[PDB]
Every structure is written in structure tokens, then in C-alpha cells.
Amino acid sequence: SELNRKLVGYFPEWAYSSEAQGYFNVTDLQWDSLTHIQYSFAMVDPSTNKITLSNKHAAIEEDFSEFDLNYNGKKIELDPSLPYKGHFNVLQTMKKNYPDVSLLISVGGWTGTRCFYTMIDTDNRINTFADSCVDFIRKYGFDGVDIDFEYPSSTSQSGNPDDFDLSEPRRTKLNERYNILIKTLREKIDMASKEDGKEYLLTAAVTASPWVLGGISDNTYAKYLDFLSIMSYDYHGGWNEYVEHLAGIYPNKEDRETVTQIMPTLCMDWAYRYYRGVLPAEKILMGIPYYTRGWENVQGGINGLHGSSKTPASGKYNILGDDLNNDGVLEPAGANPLWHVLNLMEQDPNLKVYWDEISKVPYVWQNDKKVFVSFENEKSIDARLEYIQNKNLGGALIWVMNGDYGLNPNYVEGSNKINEGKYTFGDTLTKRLSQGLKKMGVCNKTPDDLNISLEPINVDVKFNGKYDHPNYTYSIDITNYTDKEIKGGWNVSFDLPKSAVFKSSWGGTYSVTDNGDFNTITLTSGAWQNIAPNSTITVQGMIGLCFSGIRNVTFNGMNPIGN
Numbered sequence: 398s399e400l401n402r403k404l405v406g407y408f409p410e411w412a413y414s415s416e417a418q419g420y421f422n423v424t425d426l427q428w429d430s431l432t433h434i435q436y437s438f439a440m441v442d443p444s445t446n447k448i449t450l451s452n453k454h455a456a457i458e459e460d461f462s463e464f465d466l467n468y469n470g471k472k473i474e475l476d477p478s479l480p481y482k483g484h485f486n487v488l489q490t491m492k493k494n495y496p497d498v499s500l501l502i503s504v505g506g507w508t509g510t511r512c513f514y515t516m517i518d519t520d521n522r523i524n525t526f527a528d529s530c531v532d533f534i535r536k537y538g539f540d541g542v543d544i545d546f547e548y549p550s551s552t553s554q555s556g557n558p559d560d561f562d563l564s565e566p567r568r569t570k571l572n573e574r575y576n577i578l579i580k581t582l583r584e585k586i587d588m589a590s591k592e593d594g595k596e597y598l599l600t601a602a603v604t605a606s607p608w609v610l611g612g613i614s615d616n617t618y619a620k621y622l623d624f625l626s627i628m629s630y631d632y633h634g635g636w637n638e639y640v641e642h643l644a645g646i647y648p649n650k651e652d653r654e655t656v657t658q659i660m661p662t663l664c665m666d667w668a669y670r671y672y673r674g675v676l677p678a679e680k681i682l683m684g685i686p687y688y689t690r691g692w693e694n695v696q697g698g699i700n701g702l703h704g705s706s707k708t709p710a711s712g713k714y715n716i717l718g719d720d721l722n723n724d725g726v727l728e729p730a731g732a733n734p735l736w737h738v739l740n741l742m743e744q745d746p747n748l749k750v751y752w753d754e755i756s757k758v759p760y761v762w763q764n765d766k767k768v769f770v771s772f773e774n775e776k777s778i779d780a781r782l783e784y785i786q787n788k789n790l791g792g793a794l795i796w797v798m799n800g801d802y803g804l805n806p807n808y809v810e811g812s813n814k815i816n817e818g819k820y821t822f823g824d825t826l827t828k829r830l831s832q833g834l835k836k837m838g839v840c841n842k843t844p845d846d847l848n849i850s851l852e853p854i855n856v857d858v859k860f861n862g863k864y865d866h867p868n869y870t871y872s873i874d875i876t877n878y879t880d881k882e883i884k885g886g887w888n889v890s891f892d893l894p895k896s897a898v899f900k901s902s903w904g905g906t907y908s909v910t911d912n913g914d915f916n917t918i919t920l921t922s923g924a925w926q927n928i929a930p931n932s933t934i935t936v937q938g939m940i941g942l943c944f945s946g947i948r949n950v951t952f953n954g955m956n957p958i959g960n
């Protein structure tokens with residue numbers, strides 16, 4: 398079961414009452430194609446440290462009397478035997494006909510991370526929170542918990558600026574405390590599974606940003622997850638001038654934001670390599686956007702791409718923009734669901750779709766208004782399927798399900814109203830993903846690190862280091878726990894993810910050997926670097942860029958089992 402491909406979709410609690418979101422509700426979910434639904438979003442309560450609803454009315458009270466609950470052709474009624482209404486009732490009602498679709502509550506997000514910062518301050522608060530998650534999934538019929546903490550990183554000024562008053566004083570400890578949080582959640586959830594005779598899940602949505610990851614020093618938490626969802630989107634957008642892809646798959650040496658770095662990092666494939674340090678591919682999901690970002694008055698570039706703009710796209714090119722002060726005046730971002738961009742192209746023959754064969758995503762360009770908007774289409778879905786099969790990925794997650802497209806029942810020829818275009822939300826790309834994931838078959842089981850099959854030696858190898866972008870300075874402590882001195886000229890090897898490049902060893906000599914998603918680094922010491930019994934020697938060096946961890950550590954051709 399665990400090697401099955403996964404297609405994980407985020408459900409937006411806020412969409413059902415919003416014009417720009419298409420009034421999307423639970424009966425509009427792509428139930429025939431998704432394997433998991435992540436409900437977005439719950440939060441942490443500031444005073445009790447327990448899981449809490451964001452829009453309680455939407456989640457458990459709304460009766461949908463003014464909305465249309467219909468699946469296929471049949472009217473869907475709320476189950477009157479449940480003690481709650483809202484989205485949660487509709488989810489449980491649909492689950493009866495889709496018993497193998499897993500439902501998870503997602504805690505966090507960009508605007509729901511704030512009270513994680515105070516909850517992680519003490520072990521008792523973490524225990525309270527974790528217990529409250531168990532209580533919540535039992536109460537509301539969820540199959541698991543997804544943690545979307547944005548972000549448990551020491552990187553200053555990362556995450557929502559509204560929360561700097563809580564995140565900035567805590568930067569040095571966030572990663573350690575997050576690791577404790579995830580481990581505690583796993584322990585409590587596993588106990589609840591045994592008690593209930595049910596297999597509850599724990600997942601996390603995680604950063605793909607090298608900037609954020611530079612402030613993450615311990616990725617052990619990943620081993621406690623059923624799967625790790627890489628947020629391989631928001632790579633580019635209106636926060637800066639670089640007119641570039643939202644969600645590229647492959648490294649692009651023409652991405653102007655990274656053109657001088659040792660490799661292009663703002664693409665799924667770099668994050669894949671990063672996380673291979675701690676997980677097999679079959680536990681990693683690719684993040685796919687069904688939304689856009691974009692710019693207007695683009696200067697230079699070719700069809701806008703690789704150009705510059707200080708003005709994110711506005712107006713009809715930004716229907717999902719934030720209403721910061723409730724004027725109806727939206728903050729420019731070029732942010733749209735995919736169906737709205739399709740409708741804009743129906744109305745404007747000079748808004749045209751292009752394909753980038755390097756990054757393997759499409760984009761839309763209006764050559765007269767100089768408007769560039771990212772895009773996603775059948776061709777990029779197909780490229781993403783190829784990548785998923787080629788890399789043995791566990792599947793994909795989608796942010797967010799109301800951005801996929803289908804034909805609009807409320808289409809009005811010639812209308813410019815948001816919900817009267819040819820297209821509205823639908824399942825076109827999600828069904829295409831589901832079909833491709835079925836066709837490629839289950840994941841392969843990635844073999845264990847080879848070091849476990851080698852003869853053991855009682856040597857302990859501890860790899861530590863410090864990151865000062867773009868340089869990782871490593872320090873490896875080697876402790877001899879045998880009863881005989883280890884002569885100089887010993888060697889240690891480790892597998893370094895291809896998100897990073899080994900630069901130099903500060904002592905002795907080294908070699909680098911290609912090894913799949915890693916380079917095997919072999920450090921051969923000098924004859925004078927003897928390790929006495931019960932003694933420790935330290936060697937250092939430099940690596941370019943960052944990596945989730947190292948694997949497959951050997952010492953003198955043996956497995957260093959420590960003491």
C-alpha cells in the first residue's frame with residue numbers, strides 16, 4: 398500500500414463563498430482522481446495550544462442552503478445523523494462513496510503558522526497540541542494530520558512578516574523544536590492508531606527554497622512522515638523583478654535570479670536532490686500549482702521570459718489578489734486560477750501560450766501589454782508525469798484544487814464576469830495526472846544504504862557543519878571505539894546529495910564518484926592522522942550549497958557502528 402502513487406489535493410475552506418474562487422465546495426472536489434485530500438487549514442490556538450479551526454462556520458456549521466451541493470448529477474444532502482454540518486459533514490458524506498480517499502487536516506500555511514511559534518516553546522505545550530490533534534481527527538473522522546509550518550528555519554525574515562515578533566526571537570531553536578514536534582506527533586498518532594484499529598497518517602508540506610533551507614540543520618523529522626510534500630512552487634513572483642517560472646521542473650541556467658550560483662536551484666529537481674539526503678524518492682511528492690503569478694510592463698526577455706518588471710500583474714490578470722484593506726482594491730501579484738487564464742485567452746487572441754522545453758512548464762505572454770503570467774497545462778502535466786516515473790517519486794500534491802479547469806455551466810457568451818467564462822473549475826488536469834499515475838504503476842522500493850551490508854567496525858562518524866550561504870563548512874568527528882590504534886591513511890566516505898557540490902577537504906586527499914542522486918565523497922587521511930583507542934579526530938572542509946543530510950557513511954570499507 399505504501400508504494401502506491403499518491404495524488405494529494407489541498408481543499409480551500411474559504412473558496413465556497415468567494416466569487417474569485419468560483420464558489421468551490423467539497424462536492425466540487427476531484428474525488429475520482431485524488432488519493433488524499435488535505436483540508437486547508439487549521440491553526441494553533443494562542444491560549445490553549447490546541448488545534449483550532451480557522452473558519453469554524455465553514456468547517457462545521459454551514460448548511461449550504463444558498464449553495465449547490467451536487468456530485469455527478471445527484472443532489473448531495475448533509476448527513477443529518479452527524480453532530481456537525483459544514484465542509485466536514487460533506488467530506489464524511491462523500492467519504493462513504495469514496496472510502497479509499499484519505500482525509501487529512503492541514504495545520505498551518507502562510508497565514509496559520511503564527512501560534513506554532515509559542516506552542517513549540519515547551520514540551521508540555523507540544524504534548525497538549527499533539528494530543529489535541531488525535532482528539533480532533535477522531536471527532537471529525539479524519540485519517541491523519543498534515544503539518545505546514547512556514548517555516549521552522551533559522552533564516553532571518555523568512556515566513557509571514559506578520560509573525561516576525563514571534564519567529565525572530567526564536568530563530569536559533571526553531572529547527573530543533575520542530576523536530577521534537579514532528580516526533581511527538583508521530584508517537585501520539587501511532588498510539589491512537591493502535592487503540593482505534595486504524596492507520597492514521599502524519600505528513601508535512603515543506604519548503605523547496607534554498608534560502609529557507611540554509612537555516613535548517615536537522616531534517617531527521619522527515620523519517621517520521623508517511624510522505625514529504627515538496628512545495629515546488631512560489632519559486633518566482635511579484636516580490637522581485639525576475640520574470641521567471643513559478644514552478645519549473647528542471648534546472649534552468651537562464652533563470653536570471655540564480656545565473657551566478659553554482660547551480661540553478663529554483664526548480665523541483667533541485668529540491669528533490671536536496672531531500673534525497675534523508676528520504677527515498679517514493680516518500681517524496683512533487684508540488685504542482687493550479688494558480689499563477691505574473692508581471693506587467695515587462696522589459697526585455699523573450700516573450701517576457703527572463704525579462705524584468707517592478708510591477709506585478711494587476712486588474713483582470715490578478716483575480717486572486719489580496720484585498721489588504723477591503724476596498725475591493727487587490728494587491729498586484731498576477732495571481733489567477735488556471736481556468737481564469739483560459740478565459741482571458743478566449744477573449745484576447747494576443748494572450749498566447751508558450752512552452753519552455755528546459756524548465757518544462759508553459760507560460761502566457763501578451764506582447765502588446767507586456768504581461769507575463771506563469772501557467773500549467775496538459776504539456777506540463779505530461780512532463781511532470783515523466784519526472785515522477787523517471788525519479789520513482791511517490792506522486793504529487795496540488796495547491797489548490799479549485800484552480801483546475803472544466804466547462805462552465807454558467808457560461809455567457811461575450812461576458813467578462815469572472816464566473817461567466819467558457820471555463821470554471823473542473824478536473825481536466827487532475828484526471829490526467831491520475832490516469833498517468835495509474836499507468837506507470839507502483840513505486841519501486843529503494844534499497845537500503847549499502848553501508849549496512851558491510852562488515853561492522855566500532856568507529857563513530859559524526860557529521861556536523863555550519864552554513865554561510867553559499868558555503869557549508871563541515872566538521873566530521875571520528876571516534877575510535879576499538880581496542881587498537883587506527884593508523885593514519887584511513888578513509889571515510891559519505892554520499893552527498895547532488896543539491897550540493899564538494900569543494901575541498903582541509904587535510905589529506907579526496908575523491909568524488911558519481912552515485913545516482915549523490916556523489917560519494919571519499920576522504921583519505923594522512924599517515925600522521927592516527928586515531929588512538931577511545932580518541933577522536935576531527936577533519937573539516939567545504940561544500941557548496943546545502944543538502945538535507947548525508948547517507949551511506951563508511952570507514953575503511955566497513956560500517957561504522959560506533960560504540
Ligand SMILES: N[C@@H]1[C@@H](O)[C@H](O[C@@H]2O[C@H](CO)[C@@H](O[C@@H]3O[C@H](CO)[C@@H](O[C@@H]4O[C@H](CO)[C@@H](O[C@@H]5O[C@H](CO)[C@@H](O[C@@H]6O[C@H](CO)[C@@H](O)[C@H](O)[C@H]6N)[C@H](O)[C@H]5N)[C@H](O)[C@H]4N)[C@H](O)[C@H]3N)[C@H](O)[C@H]2N)[C@@H](CO)O[C@H]1O
Nearest residue numbers: 506507508606608631632633634635636654655717718719
Ligand atoms: N545582500 C542582499 C542580497 O542577499 C539580496 O539578494 C537576494 O537575496 C535573496 C535572499 O534573501 C535571494 O533569494 C530570495 O530571497 C527572498 C527573500 O529575501 C525570497 O522572497 C520571498 O519568496 C517567497 C516565496 O518563496 C515569498 O513568499 C510568498 O509570498 C506571497 C506574497 O507575496 C504569499 O502569497 C499569499 O499566499 C497565501 C496562501 O499561501 C494567500 O492566502 C495570499 O492571498 C497570498 N498573498 C505566499 O504564500 C508566500 N509563499 C515572499 O513574499 C518573498 N519575500 C525569494 O524566494 C528568494 N529567491 C535573492 O535571489 C537575491 N537576489 C539583495 C536583493 O537584491 O540585496 C542585498 O543587499
Ligand SMILES: [Cl-]
Nearest residue numbers: 554555556557
Ligand atoms: Cl518566505
